[PDB]
Amino acid sequence: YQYSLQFFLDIYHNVLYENPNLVTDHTQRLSIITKDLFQVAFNRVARGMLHQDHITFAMLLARIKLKGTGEPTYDAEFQHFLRGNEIVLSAGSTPRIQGLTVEQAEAVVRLSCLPAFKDLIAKVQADEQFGIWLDSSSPEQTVPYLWTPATPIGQAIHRLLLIQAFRPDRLLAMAHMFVSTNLGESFMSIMEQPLDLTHIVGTEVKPNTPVLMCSVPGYDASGHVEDLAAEQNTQI
Amino acid sequence: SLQPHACFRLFLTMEINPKVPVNLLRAGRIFVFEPPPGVKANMLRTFSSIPVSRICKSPNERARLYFLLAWFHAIIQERLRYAPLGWSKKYEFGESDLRSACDTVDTWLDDTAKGRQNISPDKIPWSALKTLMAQSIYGGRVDNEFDQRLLNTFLERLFTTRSFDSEFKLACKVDGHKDIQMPDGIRREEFVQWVELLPDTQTPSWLGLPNNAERVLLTTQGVDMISKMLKMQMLE
Amino acid sequence: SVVTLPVYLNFTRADLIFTVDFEIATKEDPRSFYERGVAVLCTE
């Protein structure tokens, strides 16, 4: 995908003049334009994006929204989340092996450099009753403790860092609910639905702009275009 | 260099290859086709592929068999992701096999139901559909005898339904005190609204796999997302 | 009952070697053993 500037300008031409629930008050209109812009840019990119690359684009959109917000930017925690595996950790330090493995202990050692997560080794032994929420079981819903008054975005970043230190298989679920808390709980729920080819072909596509139909091997879409021409009574 | 008629779209379908030039990728709106993630989204795409006139025909038990065929196609396409435990090879379980299965279902239901609105569930051609799908339609791509045994086990479990009895377990979603039971709706719209009533969370245990089968793989793609971060923030 | 399990050469499971017949327990089911992809790996 090599998007030009005219793709972005066509996105804005679908932003500025296609107003849902069209309000005539500029205070609501600015927020409506911003949310409509973010959602339609995510949709018009993720329609031409593999599913493995969806959550990275959602993470970048959430980061741009956070930097566009007044909001306490936890950019040191962002940097530690973004480069914790490539950073240097300690050598020869052994935390408790009571319910945490060696890799989990090394991740706790790496995470202990954060200022909010400073009393990390005492926290995993003080909360001995929470042997299921932190490690093992299903840590998708419940996350123990916190990072002082903290924002829900900052609490979500602290939960994301705690899960990436503790239970790294549920990292994508944490990223999904971080986008849900940051951008909206139904931000990417359109992408679960099948591709409505008719409206996107008939409205969003310019006549001199071709419709590129990229396919993975083993899953083509020639019959999709055949059915689209059949329902619309057009001859291909 | 050309101005076209307004109501025209040139469709160019191709595989995802490096030999596609970057100028034509710049020129067009790209839409990428993948096997859809999740049983719910796969069954939504399957139900959107089958038209309403085909399923709502006589007899009235056509919709239950179409729902069972959609569930079977969804679980054997979602098992393809968890290789080499879902299937021993990366088969191409596309849409032509599903269309041939639908055609055989329609033809054998027209042969069995002689214009009747309903059939008692003992007289449905179970063995014909089971063998013709296990040996020709979905068994055509099967190499190993153990893959054929797994396909026969899935078809013998799925297509019985205690002769369309209610409270029939489709699978076991959670090993602890949960299962997916057969929806008791007798129409197509009940099946579609039951598909949309599915919880969006899923385990590999939906497909009979152990819950850990995706687990390490999930960790891998989490780190993959972090690796993709090293393409953005290093350039930031 | 008795369950037949293949023996694969490694974890890619692309090289079948031989089959093993195993007795099942008093509470298990053969459909679960056929469904979960229970096999034997020699090189691991």
Swiss-Prot record, chain A:
Compartments, record wording: Cytoplasm, Cytoskeleton
Q: Transmembrane ranges?
A: none
Its function, per the record, reads: Cytoplasmic dynein 1 acts as a motor for the intracellular retrograde motility of vesicles and organelles along microtubules. Dynein has ATPase activity; the force-producing power stroke is thought to occur on release of ADP. Plays a role in mitotic spindle assembly and metaphase plate congression.
Q: Which family is this protein grouped under?
A: Belongs to the dynein heavy chain family.
Q: What does the entry note on its domains?
A: Dynein heavy chains probably consist of an N-terminal stem (which binds cargo and interacts with other dynein components), and the head or motor domain. The motor contains six tandemly-linked AAA domains in the head, which form a ring. A stalk-like structure (formed by two of the coiled coil domains) protrudes between AAA 4 and AAA 5 and terminates in a microtubule-binding site. A seventh domain may also contribute to this ring; it is not clear whether the N-terminus or the C-terminus forms this extra domain.
Oligomer and partners = Homodimer. The cytoplasmic dynein 1 complex consists of two catalytic heavy chains (HCs) and a number of non-catalytic subunits presented by intermediate chains (ICs), light intermediate chains (LICs) and light chains (LCs); the composition seems to vary in respect to the IC, LIC and LC composition. The heavy chain homodimer serves as a scaffold for the probable homodimeric assembly of the respective non-catalytic subunits. The ICs and LICs bind directly to the HC dimer and dynein LCs assemble on the IC dimer. Interacts with DYNC1LI1; DYNC1LI1 and DYNC1LI2 bind mutually exclusive to DYNC1H1.
Q: State the disease linkage annotated in the record.
A: Charcot-Marie-Tooth disease, axonal, type 2O: An axonal form of Charcot-Marie-Tooth disease, a disorder of the peripheral nervous system, characterized by progressive weakness and atrophy, initially of the peroneal muscles and later of the distal muscles of the arms. Charcot-Marie-Tooth disease is classified in two main groups on the basis of electrophysiologic properties and histopathology: primary peripheral demyelinating neuropathies (designated CMT1 when they are dominantly inherited) and primary peripheral axonal neuropathies (CMT2). Cortical dysplasia, complex, with other brain malformations 13: An autosomal dominant disorder characterized by global developmental delay with impaired intellectual development. Some patients show signs of peripheral neuropathy, such as abnormal gait and hyporeflexia. CDCBM13 is associated with variable neuronal migration defects resulting in cortical malformations.
Tell me what this protein is called. Cytoplasmic dynein 1 heavy chain 1
Species annotation:
Homo sapiens
Tell me the classification of the organism that encodes this protein: Eukaryota, Metazoa, Chordata, Craniata, Vertebrata
**What would be the name of the gene that encodes this protein?**
DYNC1H1
From Swiss-Prot, chain C:
Q: What is this protein called?
A: Cytoplasmic dynein 1 heavy chain 1
Associated condition reads: Charcot-Marie-Tooth disease, axonal, type 2O: An axonal form of Charcot-Marie-Tooth disease, a disorder of the peripheral nervous system, characterized by progressive weakness and atrophy, initially of the peroneal muscles and later of the distal muscles of the arms. Charcot-Marie-Tooth disease is classified in two main groups on the basis of electrophysiologic properties and histopathology: primary peripheral demyelinating neuropathies (designated CMT1 when they are dominantly inherited) and primary peripheral axonal neuropathies (CMT2).
Phylogenetic lineage: Eukaryota, Metazoa, Chordata, Craniata, Vertebrata
Q: What is known of its domains?
A: Dynein heavy chains probably consist of an N-terminal stem (which binds cargo and interacts with other dynein components), and the head or motor domain. The motor contains six tandemly-linked AAA domains in the head, which form a ring. A stalk-like structure (formed by two of the coiled coil domains) protrudes between AAA 4 and AAA 5 and terminates in a microtubule-binding site. A seventh domain may also contribute to this ring; it is not clear whether the N-terminus or the C-terminus forms this extra domain.
| Function according to Swiss-Prot or TrEMBL | Cytoplasmic dynein 1 acts as a motor for the intracellular retrograde motility of vesicles and organelles along microtubules. Dynein has ATPase activity; the force-producing power stroke is thought to occur on release of ADP. Plays a role in mitotic spindle assembly and metaphase plate congression.
Q: Which residues of the full protein are shown?
A: 4603 to 4646 of 4646
Q: Which family does it belong to?
A: Belongs to the dynein heavy chain family.
Cellular localization per UniProt: Cytoplasm, Cytoskeleton
Q: How does it assemble?
A: Homodimer. The cytoplasmic dynein 1 complex consists of two catalytic heavy chains (HCs) and a number of non-catalytic subunits presented by intermediate chains (ICs), light intermediate chains (LICs) and light chains (LCs); the composition seems to vary in respect to the IC, LIC and LC composition. The heavy chain homodimer serves as a scaffold for the probable homodimeric assembly of the respective non-catalytic subunits. The ICs and LICs bind directly to the HC dimer and dynein LCs assemble on the IC dimer. Interacts with DYNC1LI1; DYNC1LI1 and DYNC1LI2 bind mutually exclusive to DYNC1H1.
